[PDB]
Design a protein around this ligand. Structure first.
Ligand SMILES: OC[C@H]1O[C@@](CO)(O[C@H]2O[C@H](CO)[C@@H](O)[C@H](O)[C@H]2O)[C@@H](O)[C@@H]1O
Ligand SMILES: OC[C@H]1O[C@@](CO)(O[C@H]2O[C@H](CO)[C@@H](O)[C@H](O)[C@H]2O)[C@@H](O)[C@@H]1O
Ligand SMILES: OC[C@H]1O[C@@](CO)(O[C@H]2O[C@H](CO)[C@@H](O)[C@H](O)[C@H]2O)[C@@H](O)[C@@H]1O
Ligand SMILES: O=N[O-]
Ligand SMILES: O=N[O-]
Ligand SMILES: O=N[O-]
Ligand SMILES: O=N[O-]
Ligand SMILES: O=N[O-]
Ligand SMILES: O=N[O-]
Ligand SMILES: [Cu+2]
Ligand SMILES: [Cu+2]
Ligand SMILES: [Cu+2]
Ligand SMILES: [Cu+2]
Ligand SMILES: [Cu+2]
Ligand SMILES: [Cu+2]
Lengths: 334, 334, 334
C-alpha cells in the first residue's frame, strides 16, 4: 500500500551516530534499518570480569537510529542460528503491539520485518521484551538502544529559535548484575542460560554490580574519550532502559535539556544535573567554553567512580581566564 | 459557620473512580466522604504469600476522592473496635495540622470528622501518619490513597484548549516489605503488631519484596484488566506514597502528562515514561490508537515483571496498519 | 586584569544563610569567600553513633554562598596541617577545570585561591572531588554544600511577577554509610583513613545507614527547628550531592518550585512533593497560611522517620478554620 521513497541507513556503533540531517526539506520516507542480534560473553571491567551479554548489532547500547517525524521506520530484525534464545524488539517511539514486541518474536534462525510510523518526536528507548521474566533479563543483559525522531525543522528552544548541534553522541547506560561466589569473586558462566538463575536472584535485589557507559568500565575514556572544541555545540543523548540515572557534565552544564526526552516540550536551560527515568532516553546540549578534560557521569558518584559510570571529554581550544582562573596556586598557609 | 450545600459521595474501590463532573457549573459545596479503616491479612501474590495490610475502606490503594477547586472536603474517618492500632489521615491536598494528621488520631472504637478546603488543584496522596516510626510502617502496610481536585473548568493543555477524558483509572502502587525466614520463604504473621519488628528491620534496608498495583500481583489483569476502545481518551492517575515509580504504557505514550501531578502547571506532551516521586500522585492521559493488549508498568522492568508491578489494558477497535505493520512475518533467514 | 570592586562575605553555618540582597542595583563585584576544611569525628544520631566527617567550614552541609549573576566568586580554600588528606573544590555553578577541582587540589598545610564567573543562575552544589574513588568518599563524608546565584532583578514567577522571600533556609541532605560489626552495632574508627576500607565496601552496595539534614538526626528540631510566621514567604534550598531526595512540607506545599534548581526556568506551582536529583540543589518557596508544627521531610518515609531525614518548622500565627477545621473531635462510633 505504502508508496513512499526508500532510504537505507548504515548504522554505526555507539557513541557515534549515523549521518543525518537536522532540518530537512525531504518529505516522509521509508527508512530501512537492519539489526542483527548477537549473544556473546564480554569483558566489562578493567579486572577482567566477564558478562553474558545479549546485544543488538554487537554493541551495548544498540546503535542510535535517527529519523524525522512522519517517516516510516522499517527494521529487519535478524536472530541468527548461532544464538540460543528467542528475541524481539519494542520501540517506545512506536504505537501498537507492545511497541512492536508482539509482532517481532523470532527464534534463532529467523528474521522479521516491522514498520512503524514516527508520529512522536524525541529520543526513545528500544529494547527486547520476549515475555514475562525474560523481559528484564534480556534488557539488563544489554538488549537496549535508542531512536531519535527529529522535527523536520530541526530542534528549537521553545522561545522560536533554532538549536543546531555540531555533533551528537549517544551514551547508553547499562545496569549489570554479576553474581559473586562465596569467596566474593565475580562468577563467570558458559552461556546466558547458565547465568540466568544466579543473575535473576541478584536482579530481584535491585542493586547492580556495575553501571557502565558503552558496555564497559572506561569505554568512553583514553583513545575513546568523547571530543569537542571550544565553540562547538554538542548534543548528548543518554538512555537507560531499566533504571534511573542523573547525568552531569563536570565542568560544564546542560545549556538546553530535554530530560524526559521529547521535543514537543521546550528544553529547560542552564542545568547542573538532569534525570533520565529508567525506561527512557533524554538529551542535553552544551556549547563548550573551556578546553581540557571533562568527566560526564551519573551523579551518584559511587556509581560513577566505583561502579563504572564515567566518560571523558577531551576539549581543544583556548582557556578563558574571565570564566575561571587560579588566582593563587597552592601555597603554604601564611 | 459554613453555610454551603452538602453533597454525599459513594466511594468505589480502585481502580475505578466515583462518578464526577469534569467541568462544572456548580459552585463550592461541602463534599462528604467516609473512610473506614480495616486491618486485615491478605494474599499479595500468586504463590499465596500473605501480608498484614492496613487499609482505608478495605482496599490498597484507598479509594480516589474527587472534588473541585474551592470545595470543602468533609471526611468521617472511622476506626472500628475490631482494629488494633490507632490511625489518622494526612491529605497532601490540605493546608495545616500536618495535612490533617494532627486533628484525626483515633483509637479503635473512635471516629473523627475533618474538613479541609481544596485550594490546590491536582492529584494528591493521602495517607495515615500516626507519629514517629509508625508513619512509614502504616503507609507501607497499605494506608494510602489519593484525592483529585479538578479545576471547575475541567482540564486544559496549557496551550487554551480543553482536555476531556472519557474515563479515569486510579493505579495505586505499593512497595511491600515481607521478611523471609532462614529457609528463604516469606514469613506469615498473626497480627500487624507481630509483623512489626521483622518488617521494620527490612524496611530500613530500603528494598521491597513486592511492588504491586491495586494490592496484589496481577490485580489489574485477566477479568480485571483495564479496558478502552480505540478513540477513547483515558486518564491514568498513579500514586506512590513512599517510593519513586516510573510509569510507562507499553505500546502507547503519555499524550498529556502531569508527572508532578498539579493542574496549575501545563502538562508535558508525548512522553514515553514519566516519574512519580515517592510521596505524590501524577496523572497521564492517552488517546488509544490501536487495539490489543497493552501493559502498564513501572519501567524498572525487574519490578514490573518480577516483583509485581504490571497492569494490562485490553483495547477494542480496528488495527491501524499505517501506524504499525508486520511487513514480513517471522521466516528463515535467507 | 580584573578591575572590579571587592566585597567580603562572612559565611554563616547552615541552615542559616549570610545576609544578601535579592534584587540589587549593584553591578558585578568580586565576592570573596573563605572555606577552611575540617576533618573531624562527629556524632550523627541520638544513640551516639560516631562518624568520620570531612567538612567545609566545620559543618554538614558546607555553608550556602550567595552571589548575583555576573559576579566573580573568589574563594580561598584552606586545608590546615591538622588534616590528613588532600582536598579540593568543584563548583557546579562554574565553567571549566572540572568545576574548579583541577585547579584547587591542596595538601594539608596549603591553601589556594580560585575565581569563577557566575554565568548561570540558580542553586548549585559544590563538593570536594580529589580524584578517582576518593570522589564519592569525600562527598559522602560530608564535603559538599551549595551556592545560590540570584538574578540581579531577584526571582520571578515566569508569568512577569516578582517573587520575594522573607527568609531563606538551606537544608543539606547527607547520605551516610556507617558499617556494622558482627554484633550488628555501628563501628567507630580512629581516623578517616581507618574508616575507608569498610566504608567503601558499604558505599558500593548503595544503601545508606543514615540520611540526615544538617549533619545529624534531629538537627533541625527542638531549639533548632526552623521558624516562620503565618504570612511569611520562606525559600527552602535543598541539596543532595550524591543521591536523590524527594522533599515535602507536611501540612504545606511548594507554592513555587524549581526542583532542578535553575532560575532561567519558570517555577512549577502548587506541588506536594518535589525531586532533588543527586548531584544538585533545588529550591521551593511557600507562604505559610497556618500556625503550628510542620515536618519537612524526604518523602521516602522510611528515610524520613527511621534513617534521620526530618526537620521541623514551628510557625506562629492565627489558625484559619476556613482552610481546615476539626468538625467533630474523636468520639465513640455511634
Ligand atoms: O520547543 C517546543 C515548544 O516550543 C513551542 C513554542 O513555545 O513550539 C515550537 O515548537 C513546536 C514543535 O517543534 C513547533 O511546532 C512550533 O511551531 C514552535 O513554535 C511550544 O508550543 C513547544 O512546547
Ligand atoms: O494548564 C495550565 C497552564 O495553562 C495556562 C496557560 O498557559 O493557564 C490555563 O490554565 C489555568 C489553570 O487552569 C487557567 O486559569 C488559565 O486561564 C488558562 O489559560 C498557564 O498559566 C498554566 O500554567
Ligand atoms: O522565570 C523564568 C522564566 O520567565 C520568563 C518569562 O516567561 O522570563 C522572565 O525571567 C527571565 C529570567 O529572569 C527574564 O530575563 C525575563 O525578562 C523574564 O520575562 C522565561 O523566559 C523564563 O524561562
Ligand atoms: O565480537 N568480537 O569482536
Ligand atoms: O561535579 N562532579 O561530581
Ligand atoms: O475482606 N474480605 O473480603
Ligand atoms: O516497553 N516496555 O518495557
Ligand atoms: O568542633 N567542635 O565544635
Ligand atoms: O505527609 N507526610 O508524610
Ligand atoms: Cu532478547
Ligand atoms: Cu519498554
Ligand atoms: Cu494507620
Ligand atoms: Cu505525606
Ligand atoms: Cu575532600
Ligand atoms: Cu559534582
Amino acid at each position: 500500500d505504502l508508496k513512499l521513497p526508500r532510504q537505507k541507513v548504515e548504522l554505526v556503533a555507539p557513541p557515534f551516530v549515523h549521518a543525518h540531517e537536522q532540518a530537512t526539506k525531504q518529505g516522509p520516507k521509508i527508512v530501512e534499518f537492519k539489526l542483527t542480534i548477537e549473544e556473546k560473553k564480554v569483558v566489562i571491567d578493567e579486572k577482567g570480569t566477564t558478562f553474558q551479554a545479549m546485544t543488538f548489532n554487537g554493541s551495548m547500547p544498540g546503535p542510535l537510529m535517527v529519523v524525522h517525524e512522519g517517516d516510516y521506520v522499517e527494521t529487519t530484525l535478524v536472530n541468527p542460528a548461532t544464538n540460543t534464545m528467542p528475541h524481539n524488539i519494542d520501540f517506545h517511539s512506536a504505537t501498537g503491539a507492545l511497541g512492536g514486541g508482539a509482532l517481532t518474536l523470532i527464534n534463532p534462525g529467523e528474521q522479521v520485518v516491522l514498520r512503524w510510523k514516527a508520529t512522536k518526536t524525541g529520543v526513545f528507548v528500544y529494547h527486547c521484551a520476549p515475555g514475562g521474566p525474560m523481559i528484564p533479563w534480556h534488557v539488563v543483559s544489554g538488549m537496549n538502544g535508542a531512536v531519535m525522531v527529529l522535527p523536520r525543522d530541526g530542534l528549537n528552544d521553545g522561545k522560536g529559535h533554532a538549536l543546531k548541534y555540531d555533533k551528537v553522541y549517544y551514551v547508553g547506560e547499562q545496569d549489570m548484575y554479576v553474581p559473586r561466589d562465596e569467596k566474593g569473586n565475580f562468577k563467570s558462566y558458559d552461556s546466558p542460560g547458565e547465568a540466568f538463575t544466579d543473575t535473576e536472584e541478584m536482579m530481584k535485589k535491585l542493586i547492580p554490580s556495575h553501571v557502565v557507559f558503552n558496555g564497559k568500565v572506561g569505554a568512553l575514556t583514553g583513545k575513546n574519550a568523547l571530543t569537542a572544541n571550544v565553540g562547538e555545540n554538542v548534543l548528548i543523548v543518554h538512555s537507560q532502559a531499566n533504571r534511573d540515572s542523573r547525568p552531569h557534565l563536570i565542568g560544564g552544564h546542560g545549556d538546553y535539556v530535554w530530560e524526559t526526552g521529547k521535543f514537543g516540550n521546550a528544553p529547560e536551560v542552564g542545568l547542573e544535573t538532569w534525570f533520565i527515568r529508567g525506561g527512557s532516553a533524554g538529551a542535553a546540549m552544551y556549547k563548550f567554553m573551556q578546553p581540557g578534560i571533562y568527566a560526564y557521569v551519573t551523579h551518584n558518584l559511587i556509581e560513577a567512580a566505583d561502579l563504572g559510570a564515567t566518560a571523558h571529554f577531551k576539549v581543544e581550544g583556548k582557556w578563558n581566564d574571565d570564566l575561571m582562573t587560579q588566582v593563587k596556586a597552592p601555597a603554604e598557609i601564611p
